[PDB]
């Protein structure tokens, strides 16, 4: 909201001259209004979208997005702060596609060992007593991480 502060992170990207993609619980008009004008004159090309859903649900799926793109998740809850984060902590992707109801990333740049490692930790998740519902949602993450969804 008034949580606009994070300028040095923002300008670092401006210095870079590259577009910025933002994933968080929510973004309010104060941040969006300035963002729109900054993008319009070509200072920065930046668009923001909302996280997957429920607190535990979105938080759980944030690490894979970051690791897949080689980025770092900002732990507000833990040892990290809004401003506290370098440009290098940001994830990188070839391009993204955004529409009114959907967000897509063509290809984040991350190491295969990290991609597989995310998948490897999933194996405990795969063989689960709960089975119904737990596996269905879980597999969807899995397919997105390295496979495909039909």
């Amino acid at each position: 909201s008034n949580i606009r502060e994070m300028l040095p992170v923002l300008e670092a990207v401006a210095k870079a001259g590259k577009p910025l993609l933002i994933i968080a619980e929510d973004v309010e008009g104060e941040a969006l209004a300035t963002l729109v004008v900054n993008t319009m004159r070509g200072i920065v090309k930046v668009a923001a979208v909302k996280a997957p859903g429920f607190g535990d649900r979105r938080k759980a799926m944030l690490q894979d997005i970051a690791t897949l793109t080689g980025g770092t998740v900002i732990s507000e809850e833990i040892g990290m702060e809004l401003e506290k984060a370098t440009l290098e902590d940001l994830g990188q992707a070839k391009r993204v596609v955004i529409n009114k109801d959907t967000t897509t990333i063509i290809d984040g740049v991350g190491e295969e060992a990290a991609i597989q490692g995310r998948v490897a930790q999933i194996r405990q998740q795969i063989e689960e007593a709960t089975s119904d519902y737990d596996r269905e949602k879980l597999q969807e993450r899995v397919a997105k991480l390295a496979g495909g969804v039909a």
Binding site: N2, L7, P8, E11, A14, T34, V37
Partner: protein, 97 residues
């Protein structure tokens, strides 16, 4: 018409609030903040305290100053423009060079 201050009173005008130059070339809009810089339009005769003579003010007309916007600061409209009225004590510093 113009204004003549009544000793120890200085009439100054406020400068731009949160000018869009913060953090670089970034345009920063006004989001609940006020400007403390001003220009001295008029100078009063001086302090009348302790009876012995009147002491002259340390600020000349046309100076650029930094001041504390407190209770001692009054607002009036002259020639349909906003001005500030405060004592010498309320002005914290002078911007020079």
């Amino acid at each position: 018409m113009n204004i003549r201050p009544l000793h120890d009173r200085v009439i100054v005008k406020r400068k731009e609030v949160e000018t869009k130059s913060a953090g670089g070339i970034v345009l920063t809009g006004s989001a609940a903040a006020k400007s403390t810089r001003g220009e001295v339009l008029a100078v009063g005769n001086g302090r009348i305290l302790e009876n012995g003579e009147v002491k002259p003010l340390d600020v000349k007309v046309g100076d650029i100053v930094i001041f504390n916007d407190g209770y001692g600061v009054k607002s009036e409209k002259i020639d349909n423009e906003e001005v500030l009225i405060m004592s010498e004590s309320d002005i914290l510093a002078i911007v020079e060079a």
